[PDB]
Design a protein around this nucleic acid. Structure first.
Ligand SMILES: [Mg+2]
Ligand SMILES: [Mg+2]
Ligand SMILES: [Mg+2]
Ligand SMILES: [Mg+2]
Ligand SMILES: [Mg+2]
Ligand SMILES: [Mg+2]
Ligand SMILES: [Mg+2]
Ligand SMILES: [Mg+2]
Ligand SMILES: [Mg+2]
Lengths: 292, 75, 159, 213, 170
RNA sequence: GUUUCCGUAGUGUAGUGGUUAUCACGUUCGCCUAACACGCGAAAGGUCCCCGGUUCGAAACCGGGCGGAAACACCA
RNA sequence: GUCUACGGCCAUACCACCCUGAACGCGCCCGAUCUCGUCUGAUCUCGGAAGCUAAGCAGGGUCGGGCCUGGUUAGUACUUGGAUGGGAGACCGCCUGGGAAUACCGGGUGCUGUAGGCUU
RNA sequence: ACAGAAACCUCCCGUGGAGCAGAAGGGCAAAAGCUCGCUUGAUCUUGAUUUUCAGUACGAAUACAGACCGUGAAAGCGGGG
RNA sequence: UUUAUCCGGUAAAGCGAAUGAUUAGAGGUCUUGGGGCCGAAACGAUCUCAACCUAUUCUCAAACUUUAAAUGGGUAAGAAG
C-alpha cells in the first residue's frame, strides 16, 4: 500500500483550472494581452486574426472580443478552396496563404473596401505592409493570434498572416519568421518565399520522390496523383486561386432544411429510473443468495 | 514620570461638534489630475468650436422654424 | 505602537477568497468605465500593480479619469472629522460597477414612462416610493380545525 | 510547586496553545484520558455515566489526574478490573503562565517591579464550558451505582461545581440507547471495537453487497 | 482481433552511470555513440553526496534514448546476452520493463585496453498508437483506463516476440 | 534572576574563510636493556556538548536548549 | 440532435470508474523532399493520407467520491439595545430587536455567446 | 548493473504538499516555479496622485504624459529587482 | 430611520474541509523496525512495541479556517436630473 493521494481532501481542496485550459486550447494570459482593449477606448473593439491550423483543415477568422463571448466578423476555412480550383494539399503552408487571403477579401468586400488596399497582387514574398489612403476609409487592422503553435520560422500560422497582409489587412507582422529567413545571417532570400508561397516545396518533394522510387509516390501522396495534379502545374493552380479568390471572395452558404430530426444520442436517466435500479438490484441479489 | 500613551476618548465629540461636512461638491470640478493627452486634445476641441458656428446658427434656426412649424401645425 | 506599512492587516482582506487562486477572469478587464460612473473599490492580491489601499478597501466613488489600464476615482475618506473627497489611481482589476445606483435608473425609467403615459388620461399616479405600510385589516380563516395547542415542553437535562 | 488553583481558576485570557509561539512548556501532568478495558465492545458494556461541568472555568492538569485516579480506585472494588472503561475528555492544553515569582534575596535591593511583566510557562489547564463533559465511564447496566459514586468522589478533586448524569446513548456512541438493538439488527450501525460505524444509504452498492450477504 | 493496439516499443533508454566526471565518463559516451549512432547526453548531479565522491552540478552519467527500428535492433542484440530470459519483477506496474547488462563488449563491441568495460542499463518504454496524446502540447490528455499497458500485458508482450521464459521467484 | 565565556582524540589544549582536523601527552607493537627507565622505529582513537534552520555542504553560520565556568545586583 | 472554430461565466464543469460513436469535423495515424526543431522527427515544423474509434473527445452509466443547491441542527449557538434582574463569584435569568455553523437527511450535475458544418 | 533510506535513468500518480535572495505575512503554474537568447525600461523629462499626514517634509509607492530604446511574428510588456 | 447596493472577517462553528496539535479504540507483514515467546532459520505461529497509513472516535488552536453571524463602514435614493 501507500497513502492515498486522492483523498476526500484531494477533491475538497482541488480547485479546477479554468475550462478552455483543461481542454488545453487557449493562452489566456496572452489572450489577456492580445484581446483586452485599452481604456482610452471604452467601447471600440480590438480585432485579432485567429489562425489555428488543425490537422486536415486550416481555419482563419477575424474576431473581436465582447463580454458575452468574442464575436467573429468573418471566417474563411481551407475546405472552401475546392471552389477556387485547389482540390488537395490544403493544410499545407501555401494553402494557408490562400485561406488568409480569402479572409482578407471576404472581410474587405464588407465595409466596402474591395476597391482599395488590395495589397500585393502578383505576389513577391516581401515586405508588403498596407498604407492607409488619406481622404478614404482608413485601413483595417488586427494583431495576429497564433494560439499555441511554437511559432518557429516557416510555420503556417504567421504564413496565413502573409495571406491576409497580401490581401489588404494591416497586421503588424515582421519577416523574421517567413520561410526564407536565414538564421545565420538575418535577411530573406524572398525568392524562397516565392516557392514557399506557391508550393514548390511540395513540387520539389513531388520530384525528389518519383525518380528514386515508385510506390512511395502514391503512398506518400495518392491524392496528389489522383485528381490529375502534377508538379509543373502546381504553381499555376495557386496563381488561379489568388486571382479567383480576389474576383469573388463572398460566401453564399448552402441553404439547409430537411432533417426528420431523430434523437440518437442517449438521454439522461430520470430520478425514479436510477431510484429503482437500486431496489431492482437488491432483490436481484437478495433473491439470488437466499438459496445458494 | 509616566503618563497616557494615546486615547481617542471624548473626540468623537469634537471632530463631530461642528459636524463632519461631507465635502461641498460643485458642478464643474477641476480637470487637473486628468491624463494630459485628454486635455492636450479637448483644448483643440474647445478652441476650434467657433470655427463651425455658421452651420450651428443656421442649423439652429432650421430646427427652430421647423419646431415653430411643429407647434403651429399642432395649433 | 504599530507599523505604518501600506499592507499591514491585509493578510486576510486582499487574500483571494477560495478556489479562485489564479487566472483573473478576463471579463473583469473588458467592461468599460467612463467618467461619472460609480464604482466600488475592492482590492485584490493577484495583481499588485495599481492596488488601492486598505483604508479604502470596500468604498465607492465616482470615476474622474480613464487611463490605459487604470481608473482615476474620487472617494470620500474619513479622517478625524473632516471627510476628504480624494482621488486615487486604481488598476481596473480592483474595481466593479456598483449596482447601488441601479435601483434608481430602473425607478427613473419607470416614472418618466408612467408619467408620459397617464398624461393622455390625466390620472395622478403614485410616483414616489413609500415605506412599508401597516399591514391592513385582513381576515384569517381556520376552516374545520381548532388551532393546535402548544405547551412549553418539560425540561430534561440532555448532555 | 505552584500557586493554589484559585489564581488560575478562571478563564480570563485567550487560549495559549503550546506551539511555536510559546515554548519551554513543562509536559502536562496528566497523560491517560482512558483506562480499564479499552479493549471492550459496544455490545457488552451499556452504561455511559458522565460527569458534567456547570460553570465556565479552568481545570488544572493536576486536578484531572487526581479526578481520574480516585475513580479508578472506587470502580475496581465495585466492578473489578475488567468491568469498566473510564474516559477523561479534557486534555489540558491551553498553557498557564507565571510571572517568575518576583525572585529576590534576603531584604533584597532590585526586582524591577513590573518591567517585562510577561511570565513563563508554568503548567497546563483545560477550558471547560457549562454542560460540557469532563469524565465519562461505561460499565454494565447492572452496575449504575458503582459509576455514580466513582464520579461522585472525583468531584472533590475538582473546583466549582458539576453534576453527575447518566446518558441515553450506547455507552460511548452518540446513538440513543432505546435504539441500538434494532439499528444493529439491520445494520444502520456496525460494530467497531469501542465505537460503531453509522452506515448510510449512500455509497456504492458493492459496499452494501458485503453486508446482508 | 484488435485494431491498432499494437503493443510496440516507444523507446529504449541507455544510461551509463559512473560517479566520476572527466575521463572514465567521457569514454563511456563513446560506447553509446558507437552502439547507437547518436551523440549521447551527459547527465549531471542533482546534488552533492559525500560517501560517493560526487558534487552538485558535477557530471556523472551519460545517457541516450533510441527509437524506431534501431531500438528493436539494440533490444535485440541486448537480450541475447540475457539469452531471451528475464525475471517477474522487471515487468513493471505501468507496462514497462528493464533488463541490465554487466559488460558493454558482449553486444558486438571491440574492447580497447584504455576504454574498459562499463555495462549499461537498458530499459524500454512500451507504448501503443495514441500514447503521444499526453506528451503533445495542444489538446493534451490522459491515456484511457484500458490503452494502458498493464504488467501482465507487458509480460506476454515480451513472451511472444522475444519468446523468453521470464523465470519466477523474485 | 540578568550579562558574558567555553565545550574538539583516553586528558590538557590548538585550528580554518564553509571542502580539509591537530599538537603534546596517553596508549598498542617492535628495539635496544639481564630487567626496568631513557632512546629509536610502527601504529589506533572522536556526530568537533545536545538540537532544529540555512546552505553544495556546518565541527566551524543562525535560532533553541543542556553541562561546566566567570561578572554585576549602586541612593535610601 | 450534434459537432468544430473562437468564446462567456469558471466543478451543476472536477475526479473515479462502467457502457456507445451513424457524418463532418474534431482526433488517433504515415513520413522527413523542404521550413524548422531535437540525443532521439519522443515533443515542435513541415508533406501527407495507407488504417481505426484502441483512447480524447463526444455521447451516455454508478443507492460512486466531489462540487452546487434545499431541508434538519434551530429559532439552537452568538448578539444591538434594555433594567436599582438573580447570583459570594464564575456566571446565569428575563425584556426589545437581530440571528449563524457542523455532523444528519434531501434534489441537481455545467449553462449558453458569435462564425461555420453534418444529420441533405 | 555495480547502486545500498540517498548518485544515474524511465513510467505512473502528483492543486499545489515545491518553488518563488529575507521575517513573516499576503501573491504566484502549458506562471511570478525552472532552462536559455537578447539586452539595458536600473535610461533622459515635465507634471498628477497614494502612503505615512498637519493631510508639512523625507522615504516608499500608484496612475498618466514626452523623449530614446529591449524584447518579442506581434498585443504588449518593460522607467531596477 | 427605511429601500437598493456594495464592503467587511470578529462572536459562534469546524476541524470526518486545508494547517497545526491530540485521545482512543477497530484496521492494516501497508512500511518497516527493535525486543520477545514459540521457532536453526523461515511476512512460519503467536505475541509485543515502533512508526506509517484505511475506515473511525476524544479533545483543541491568538501568531488556523471550509463555513460563518450580531453590532459596524461606503455609495445611492434626480433640475447639477
Ligand atoms: Mg507567447
Ligand atoms: Mg513522427
Ligand atoms: Mg475514441
Ligand atoms: Mg471507444
Ligand atoms: Mg455524490
Ligand atoms: Mg440606567
Ligand atoms: Mg512564460
Ligand atoms: Mg514612456
Ligand atoms: Mg483579524
Amino acid at each position: 500500500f501507500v497513502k492515498v493521494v486522492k483523498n476526500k481532501a484531494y477533491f475538497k481542496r482541488y480547485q479546477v483550472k479554468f475550462r478552455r485550459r483543461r481542454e488545453g486550447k487557449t493562452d489566456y494570459y496572452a489572450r489577456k494581452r492580445l484581446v483586452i482593449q485599452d481604456k482610452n477606448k471604452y467601447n471600440t473593439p480590438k480585432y485579432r486574426m485567429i489562425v489555428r491550423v488543425t490537422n486536415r483543415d486550416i481555419i482563419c477568422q477575424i474576431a473581436y472580443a465582447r463580454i458575452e463571448g468574442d464575436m467573429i466578423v468573418c471566417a474563411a476555412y481551407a475546405h472552401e478552396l475546392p471552389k477556387y480550383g485547389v482540390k488537395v494539399g490544403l493544410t499545407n503552408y501555401a494553402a494557408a496563404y490562400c485561406t488568409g487571403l480569402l479572409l482578407a477579401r471576404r472581410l474587405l468586400n464588407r465595409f466596402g473596401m474591395d476597391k482599395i488596399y488590395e495589397g500585393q497582387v502578383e505576389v513577391t514574398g516581401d515586405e508588403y505592409n498596407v498604407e492607409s489612403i488619406d481622404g478614404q476609409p482608413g485601413a483595417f487592422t488586427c494583431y495576429l493570434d497564433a494560439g499555441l503553435a511554437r511559432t518557429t520560422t516557416g510555420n503556417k500560422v504567421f504564413g496565413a498572416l502573409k495571406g491576409a497582409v497580401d490581401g489588404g489587412l494591416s497586421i503588424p507582422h515582421s519577416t523574421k519568421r517567413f520561410p526564407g529567413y536565414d538564421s545565420e545571417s538575418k535577411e530573406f532570400n524572398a525568392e524562397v518565399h516565392r516557392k514557399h508561397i506557391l508550393g514548390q516545396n511540395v513540387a520539389d518533394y513531388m520530384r525528389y520522390l518519383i525518380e528514386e522510387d515508385e510506390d512511395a509516390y502514391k503512398k506518400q501522396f495518392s491524392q496528389y496523383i489522383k485528381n490529375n495534379v502534377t508538379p509543373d502545374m502546381m504553381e499555376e493552380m495557386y496563381k488561379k486561386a489568388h486571382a479567383a479568390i480576389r474576383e469573388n471572395p463572398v460566401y453564399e452558404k448552402k441553404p439547409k432544411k430537411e432533417v426528420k430530426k431523430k434523437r440518437w444520442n442517449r438521454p439522461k436517466m430520470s430520478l425514479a429510473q436510477k431510484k429503482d435500479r437500486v431496489a431492482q438490484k437488491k432483490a436481484s441479489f437478495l433473491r439470488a443468495q437466499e438459496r445458494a | 514620570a509616566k503618563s497616557k500613551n494615546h486615547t481617542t476618548h471624548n473626540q468623537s465629540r469634537k471632530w463631530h461638534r461642528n459636524g463632519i461636512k461631507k465635502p461641498r461638491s460643485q458642478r464643474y470640478e477641476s480637470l487637473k489630475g486628468v491624463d494630459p493627452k485628454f486635455l492636450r486634445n479637448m483644448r483643440f476641441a474647445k478652441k476650434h468650436n467657433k470655427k463651425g458656428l455658421k452651420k450651428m446658427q443656421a442649423n439652429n434656426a432650421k430646427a427652430m422654424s421647423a419646431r415653430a412649424e411643429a407647434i403651429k401645425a399642432l395649433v | 505602537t504599530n507599523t505604518k506599512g501600506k499592507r499591514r492587516g491585509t493578510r486576510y482582506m486582499f487574500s483571494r477568497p477560495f478556489r479562485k487562486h489564479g487566472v483573473v477572469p478576463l471579463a473583469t478587464y473588458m467592461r468599460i468605465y467612463k467618467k461619472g460612473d460609480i464604482v466600488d473599490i475592492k482590492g485584490m492580491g493577484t495583481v499588485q500593480k495599481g492596488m488601492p489601499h486598505k483604508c479604502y478597501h470596500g468604498k465607492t466613488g465616482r470615476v474622474y479619469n480613464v487611463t490605459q489600464h487604470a481608473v482615476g476615482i474620487v472617494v470620500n475618506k474619513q479622517v478625524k472629522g473632516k471627510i476628504l473627497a480624494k482621488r486615487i489611481n486604481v488598476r481596473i482589476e480592483h474595481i466593479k460597477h456598483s449596482k447601488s445606483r441601479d435601483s434608481f435608473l430602473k425607478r427613473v425609467k419607470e416614472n418618466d414612462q408612467k408619467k408620459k403615459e397617464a398624461k393622455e388620461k390625466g390620472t395622478w399616479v403614485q410616483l414616489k416610493r413609500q415605506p412599508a405600510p401597516p399591514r391592513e385589516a385582513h381576515f384569517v380563516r381556520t376552516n374545520g380545525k381548532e388551532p393546535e395547542l402548544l405547551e412549553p415542553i418539560p425540561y430534561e437535562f440532555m448532555a | 510547586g505552584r500557586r493554589p488553583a484559585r489564581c488560575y481558576r478562571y478563564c480570563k485570557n485567550k487560549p495559549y496553545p503550546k506551539s511555536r509561539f510559546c515554548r519551554g512548556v513543562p509536559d502536562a501532568k496528566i497523560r491517560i484520558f482512558d483506562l480499564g478495558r479499552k479493549k471492550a465492545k459496544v455490545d457488552e458494556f451499556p452504561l455511559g455515566g458522565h460527569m458534567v461541568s456547570d460553570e465556565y472555568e479552568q481545570l488544572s492538569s493536576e486536578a484531572l489526574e487526581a479526578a481520574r485516579i480516585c475513580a479508578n480506585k472506587y470502580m475496581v472494588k465495585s466492578c473489578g478490573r475488567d468491568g469498566f472503561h473510564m474516559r477523561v475528555r479534557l486534555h489540558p492544553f491551553h498553557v498557564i503562565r507565571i510571572n517568575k515569582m518576583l525572585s529576590c534575596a534576603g531584604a533584597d535591593r532590585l526586582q524591577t517591579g513590573m518591567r517585562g511583566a510577561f511570565g513563563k510557562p508554568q503548567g497546563t489547564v483545560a477550558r471547560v464550558h457549562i454542560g460540557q463533559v469532563i469524565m465519562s465511564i461505561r460499565t454494565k447496566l447492572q452496575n449504575e451505582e458503582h459509576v455514580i459514586e466513582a464520579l461522585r468522589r472525583a468531584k472533590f478533586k475538582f473546583p466549582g461545581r458539576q453534576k453527575i448524569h447518566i446518558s441515553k446513548k450506547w455507552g460511548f456512541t452518540k446513538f440513543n440507547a432505546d435504539e441500538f438493538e434494532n439499528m444493529v439488527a439491520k445494520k444502520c450501525l456496525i460494530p467497531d471495537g469501542c465505537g460503531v460505524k453509522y452506515v448510510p444509504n449512500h455509497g456504492p452498492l458493492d459496499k452494501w453487497r458485503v453486508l446482508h450477504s | 482481433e484488435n485494431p491498432m493496439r499494437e503493443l510496440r516499443i516507444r523507446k529504449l533508454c541507455l544510461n551509463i552511470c559512473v560517479g566520476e566526471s572527466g575521463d572514465r565518463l567521457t569514454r563511456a559516451a563513446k560506447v553509446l555513440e558507437q552502439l547507437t549512432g547518436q551523440t549521447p547526453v551527459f547527465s549531471k548531479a542533482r546534488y552533492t553526496v559525500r560517501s560517493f565522491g560526487i558534487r552538485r552540478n558535477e557530471k556523472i552519467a551519460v545517457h541516450c534514448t533510441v527509437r524506431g527500428a534501431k531500438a528493436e535492433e539494440i533490444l535485440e542484440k541486448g537480450l541475447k546476452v540475457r539469452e531471451y530470459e528475464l525475471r517477474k519483477n522487471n515487468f513493471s506496474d505501468t507496462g514497462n520493463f528493464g533488463f541490465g547488462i554487466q559488460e558493454h563488449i558482449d553486444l558486438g563491441i571491440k574492447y580497447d585496453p584504455s576504454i574498459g568495460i562499463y555495462g549499461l542499463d537498458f530499459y524500454v518504454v512500451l507504448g501503443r498508437p495514441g500514447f503521444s496524446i499526453a506528451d503533445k502540447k495542444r489538446r493534451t490528455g490522459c491515456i484511457g483506463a484500458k490503452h494502458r499497458i498493464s504488467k501482465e500485458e507487458a509480460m506476454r508482450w515480451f513472451q511472444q516476440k522475444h519468446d523468453g521464459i521470464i523465470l519466477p521467484g523474485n
